[PDB]
Design a binder for this molecule. Structure first.
Ligand SMILES: CNC(=O)c1ccccc1OC1CCOCC1
Length: 108
């Protein structure tokens, strides 16, 4: 009853991380891999960083969690071409994410 949010968030983040379309998002994009990524994307985010944030008790509300995870998708979509494998992954996983958020009644 106290630590309810933490539990729900952890379950959701784990399901997202195990999803077969999560692989592009598991770790920070490297500048060496992506020319001018960090010029274009000002608030980078990824699921390893979110795991850390969660463990660090940063996600004190649904909204903070939802914003970080939404940003993972919107970074990817802005940066990559629309028919790229990363873009396809991003919308697949975003669909999955919204279905789990609704499924847990996460209200913000
Ligand atoms: C979400 N990822 C990207 O927008 C990305 C863009 C350009 C180059 C690499 C990228 O991320 C890699 C991070 C490590 O796994 C493979 C994708």
């Amino acid at each position: 009853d106290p630590d309810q949010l933490y539990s729900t968030l952890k379950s959701i983040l784990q399901q997202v991380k195990s999803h077969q379309s999560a692989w592009p998002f598991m770790e920070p994009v490297k500048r060496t891999e992506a020319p001018g990524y960090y010029e274009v994307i000002r608030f980078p985010m990824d699921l390893k960083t979110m795991s850390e944030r969660l463990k660090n008790r940063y996600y004190v509300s649904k909204k903070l969690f939802m914003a970080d995870l939404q940003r993972v998708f919107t970074n990817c979509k802005e940066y990559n071409p629309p028919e790229s494998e990363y873009y396809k992954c991003a919308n697949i996983l975003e669909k999955f994410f919204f279905s789990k958020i609704k499924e847990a009644g996460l209200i913000d």
